[PDB]
Design a protein around this ligand. Sequence first.
Ligand SMILES: [Mg+2]
Ligand SMILES: [Mg+2]
Ligand SMILES: [Mg+2]
Ligand SMILES: [Mg+2]
Ligand SMILES: [Mg+2]
Ligand SMILES: [Mg+2]
Ligand SMILES: [Mg+2]
Lengths: 59, 60, 59, 59, 164, 165, 161, 161
Amino acid sequence: LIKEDMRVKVHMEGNVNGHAFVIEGEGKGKPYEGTQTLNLTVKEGAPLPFSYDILTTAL
Amino acid sequence: NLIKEDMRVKVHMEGNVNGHAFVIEGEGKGKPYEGTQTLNLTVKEGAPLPFSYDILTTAL
Amino acid sequence: LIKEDMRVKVHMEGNVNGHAFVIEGEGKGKPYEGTQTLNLTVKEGAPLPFSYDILTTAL
Amino acid sequence: LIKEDMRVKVHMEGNVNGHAFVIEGEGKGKPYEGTQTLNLTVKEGAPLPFSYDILTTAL
Amino acid sequence: NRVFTKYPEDIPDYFKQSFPEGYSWERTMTYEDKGICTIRSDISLEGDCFFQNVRFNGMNFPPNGPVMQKKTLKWEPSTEKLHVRDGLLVGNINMALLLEGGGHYLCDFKTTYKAKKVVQLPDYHFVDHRIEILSNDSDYNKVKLYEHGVARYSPLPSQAWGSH
Amino acid sequence: NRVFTKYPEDIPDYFKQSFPEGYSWERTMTYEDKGICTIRSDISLEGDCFFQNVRFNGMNFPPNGPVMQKKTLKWEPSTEKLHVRDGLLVGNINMALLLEGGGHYLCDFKTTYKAKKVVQLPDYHFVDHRIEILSNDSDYNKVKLYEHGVARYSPLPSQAWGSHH
Amino acid sequence: NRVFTKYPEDIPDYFKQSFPEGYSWERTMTYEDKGICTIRSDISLEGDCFFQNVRFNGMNFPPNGPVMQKKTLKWEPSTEKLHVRDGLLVGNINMALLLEGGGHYLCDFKTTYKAKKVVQLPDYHFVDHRIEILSNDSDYNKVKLYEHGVARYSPLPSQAW
Amino acid sequence: NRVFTKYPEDIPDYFKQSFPEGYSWERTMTYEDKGICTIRSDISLEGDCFFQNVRFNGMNFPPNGPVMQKKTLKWEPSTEKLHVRDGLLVGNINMALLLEGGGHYLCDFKTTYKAKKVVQLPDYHFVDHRIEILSNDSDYNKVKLYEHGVARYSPLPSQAW
Ligand SMILES: [Mg+2]
Ligand SMILES: [Mg+2]
Ligand SMILES: [Mg+2]
Ligand SMILES: [Mg+2]
Ligand SMILES: [Mg+2]
Ligand SMILES: [Mg+2]
Ligand SMILES: [Mg+2]
């Protein structure tokens, strides 16, 4: 059912020590090779008062 | 002293416990300086809850 | 059996942070009034190079 | 200084759950070839009433 | 909402001081099978009815455990420890669920309180609490919830006097 | 998305198996300085495009820390340990944020992955990962993200052989 | 040693009841920079005089941390949660050591008291503690130590009906 | 003994570089039912002997647990996280112990290795281990212990630019 390429869309509502935000992502990945890439835009809440690193594993 | 020997309380809760999402709502009264209050709570959604209610009450 | 006035003897062998110490103590109190006093001495490894408070709830 | 064959000896005093024990071992392996072998004797405290695995990355 | 707590004269009241502006707070509940809940709530006043807005997330409860199995009876009463850290007010609690027939499923509560105004700051102090469901269905779609909390110091006077 | 993980025939793949229905996972992230995040995400497949709805709720980070002070660097590569528990797959990791200047900032990561379908279940295994920001704007309103993840057993062969417990 | 705690008549007194056989105990202290301590104690009664016999072990106290740097002024008084777990009385406590120059340094406390005789088990209750250094030479070789205790129920009414 | 850990020439082997003088280390082990172990070890080269010297201390494993009921079979291999701190290689690990039939029982692991001499420090990296009882009497009085350890980097391309 799934192949050498696949598309990615992402919607994250989140919140960190007060600040609410929304992030939307588009990208693709190689499921069978174990990789992917994602362009990430901050809809609501920009600019982030906190390290973006905490987010990345959720995206 | 804006805050009175008797007061009222409104409460909106949204939440989600091991997936199961829910919206809880209540209204009530308290006595600020006596350290007392009593709340009426209704589950507007997700009823009936699959989880011990108890984990919610100190947040409610 | 236990009475208003009772004595206490304390023996603690211990190591903190690899630093050794033996410490002993003699004290008294009132089981029903909930008080107790204790006279404590460092037997070996004095001086302790760490806050004596971490010990005190033990002693 | 360290060579393809070296030798090992190991001494362990222990308390686990009140219960005391001593344990000694002597052994061997290949440091550059990152493998190690060891022979263990429980010199005191035997038989050990708790799993031995929880001692082994220490031994 | 700690606005409802009995607070002695000699103990600043972070919560009733924060008004009319009020405050928010943030809570991690650590239960012993590492099910966690994280909570945040905003408490407002206008007139005579405060308003709590609250979000509640719980995850990693075992399906075969006392929350997922609904075998908790209630909380015990408790005592919270409140201290200022990084200009804020924190509270710490050893929490107990009484388990059906006997036993306890325990929880750490850590709460961080954040007033939207600069209020006078209290010293290390405690809060005796007691929370109780009073009326409920078996399904608890209706519930009636009582808490009583009272603030203090330790009732044990010091014998310390003079030191360096 | 652990769908995007390489999985040899040796090991069942919990994530590509789950689909067509797909899966859900829950993660807690518990930091070296006492911050915390819980996260939930639903992963579905409609067509060729995985949709990932997520709810991130981070909390309790001290205000002068490397997160709130906006001064971390990246994640380190990592290796997840993964066992079955209550018939779910659980993911455990020791994570490390490099800190601007030299030091680290640290994080346990525990995940419960839950497939909306019965699938063939794996034994204990690892995933080795690496997540990286490849580009961004000034305030990271725009970011470009690269993870890589590959599943294995231990490389160190077993030399035990024959025994009774 | 509990036994040095005031019990009210309507709380049973786990510790005292325990004599003449005595009781032992075992506690975990988990600090907030993850320094840690393990401890065990036999508490026996020879006549008027209780003998405490202890072993104490702790670790990972960061050299620059306030334990090794000696920057504690004291423990904060506290309030232990007492419950029965599988026959035993388990106490839990949130301790904080008042820092040098303002601030607090926290520690988690779990204690199990294993009586060695049939006693009458209690229901959930608390003990207000205050422990105090009352005198100490400079290097602390000689230290005098005090502790109060009071058994407790809630002083708050159960509105249960 | 991280000595017996094969280092590829890309990584500095913090371990074999610490000799002749040696290296000591310090670890804590937290089990998921919060039994807890603190341990210390000194590693002295003489001739060709590494005489390991060890103090080990274990705490509040529960009665009906796996440890006290002896239902472990082994540790799973593991992968140690190695990361220079305050000049000190700190290692971190999610260990787990396979049980008779029933799956796993988990444990956290913090180790710091301290050099007796100035050595060259590595960048962040991992040591795959596997540790194993090759043999034992029924009592474990005599136990043959093996270990395999291999330091690596990440097998994966930082495909970044
Ligand atoms: Mg002394
Ligand atoms: Mg101290
Ligand atoms: Mg022993
Ligand atoms: Mg334990
Ligand atoms: Mg030893
Ligand atoms: Mg032990
Ligand atoms: Mg194993």
